[PDB]
Amino acid sequence: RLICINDYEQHAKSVLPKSIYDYYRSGANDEETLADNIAAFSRWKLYPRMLRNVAETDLSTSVLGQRVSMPICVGATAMQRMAHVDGELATVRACQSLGTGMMLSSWATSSIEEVAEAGPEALRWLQLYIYKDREVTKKLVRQAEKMGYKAIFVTVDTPYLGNRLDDVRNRFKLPPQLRMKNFDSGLAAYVAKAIDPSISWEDIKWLRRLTSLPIVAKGILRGDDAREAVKHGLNGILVSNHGARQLDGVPATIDVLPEIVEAVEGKVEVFLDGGVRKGTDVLKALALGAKAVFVGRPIVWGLAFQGEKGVQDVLEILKEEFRLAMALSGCQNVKVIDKTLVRK
Numbered sequence: 366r367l368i369c370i371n372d373y374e375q376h377a378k379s380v381l382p383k384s385i386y387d388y389y390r391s392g393a394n395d396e397e398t399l400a401d402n403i404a405a406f407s408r409w410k411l412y413p414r415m416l417r418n419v420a421e422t423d424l425s426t427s428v429l430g431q432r433v434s435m436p437i438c439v440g441a442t443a444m445q446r447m448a449h450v451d452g453e454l455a456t457v458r459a460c461q462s463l464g465t466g467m468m469l470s471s472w473a474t475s476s477i478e479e480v481a482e483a484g485p486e487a488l489r490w491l492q493l494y495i496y497k498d499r500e501v502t503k504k505l506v507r508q509a510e511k512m513g514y515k516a517i518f519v520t521v522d523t524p525y526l527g528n529r530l531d532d533v534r535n536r537f538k539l540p541p542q543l544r545m546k547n548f549d550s551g552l553a554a555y556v557a558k559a560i561d562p563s564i565s566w567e568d569i570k571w572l573r574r575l576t577s578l579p580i581v582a583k584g585i586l587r588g589d590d591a592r593e594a595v596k597h598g599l600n601g602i603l604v605s606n607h608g609a610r611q612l613d614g615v616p617a618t619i620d621v622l623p624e625i626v627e628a629v630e631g632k633v634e635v636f637l638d639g640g641v642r643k644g645t646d647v648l649k650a651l652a653l654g655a656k657a658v659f660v661g662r663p664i665v666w667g668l669a670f671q672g673e674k675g676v677q678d679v680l681e682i683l684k685e686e687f688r689l690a691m692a693l694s695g696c697q698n699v700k701v702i703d704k705t706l707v708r709k
């Protein structure tokens with residue numbers, strides 16, 4: 366049956382209700398950037414070195430000072446219990462098994478504490494939105510601190526929700542037995558009521574003063590903004606177009622990655638998400654200077670297949686594809702994955 370990430374998507378389409386599959390699949394508007402996040406990887410070609418001794422390939426690396434087994438981590442995707450009963454608890458358990466990290470959504474169907482209890486040994490980070498209610502927002506930061514999360518990924522590309530046409534057509538809402546546990550399209554309306562469209566760099570200053578945890582700006586697409594994040598004392602940039610769900614017609618993340626790596630001059634780690642489906646995608650992102658990549662939808666398809674086991678399967682497929690891509694390219698470890706491996 367399922368031997369690559371595309372197979373898990375096809376399986377998920379067959380078992381999920383249409384409205385749920387569409388919620389997870391969709392991009393914004395005409396979905397131009399959704400297609401490009403994948404197509405763009407194909408335009409970057411690989412230039413493998415031969416004869417380098419790849420008997421011992423070491424995939425390990427570090428994200429913000431914490432060791433991981435592979436440069437492939439789980440991105441925040443809301444409302445995982447729609448895909449499988451165990452939702453975020455299945456995901457964190459898989460991450461713990463694999464030795465990689467999980468970025469927990471602010472809009473999770475499981476609490477900060479519940480996820481820490483299911484994956485006490487797992488590397489865990491909190492994705493944060495700046496809510497109009499700053500008391501709410503501070504409580505989430507404080508809970509992440511108390512519960513052993515290692516960083517805050519502040520999402521900065523969602524002052525309002527993007528217009529995902531299928532969610533408007535299906536009038537998307539949660540199924541009746543689920544809730545966001547830490548507190549037209551129903552989600553777009555939720556955002557307009559709860560999420561602060563006024564936030565600015567001044568609010569980044571506030572968040573930087575609020576916690577000593579490492580803070581990564583998630584959703585940056587311009588070099589000037591990346592430089593501003595560094596000036597505000599943030600500790601990394603997650604180059605992201607929100608899975609192509611916010612502004613349609615922005616570039617693919619792999620295409621804007623080099624500008625952002627150049628702009629930050631090595632001062633902070635740069636990460637990528639958007640369109641990662643294959644081990645060669647991971648290799649390309651690392652050659653262009655990303656420390657690690659995050660996967661969004663593939664994790665949800667793993668949950669839809671088989672909960673914890675299906676997430677573990679998806680992560681193991683990515684890990685093995687990445688190992689093979691490294692070996693065929695002549696790379697024994699991540700430290701020798703250099704820029705001459707790729708050209709556009």
Ligand SMILES: Cc1cc2nc3c(=O)[nH]c(=O)nc-3n(C[C@H](O)[C@H](O)[C@H](O)COP(=O)(O)O)c2cc1C
Nearest residue numbers: 389441442443470520607608638639640660661662
């Ligand atoms: C179904 C879905 C839910 C998402 N929920 C969140 C969220 O709660 N918070 C957030 O910052 N980003 C959210 N994102 C964006 C992801 O964190 C990530 O940027 C994106 O999924 C990466 O692209 P990929 O799905 O192609 O791997 C979501 C994406 C999807 C597809």
Ligand SMILES: O=C(C1CC1)N1CCN(c2ccc(F)cc2)CC1
Nearest residue numbers: 496497498501545547548558559560
């Ligand atoms: O994260 C959540 C939900 C998952 C539970 N909340 C925090 C922000 N709250 C907020 C209230 C009023 C308001 F006008 C703006 C923001 C309510 C929603």
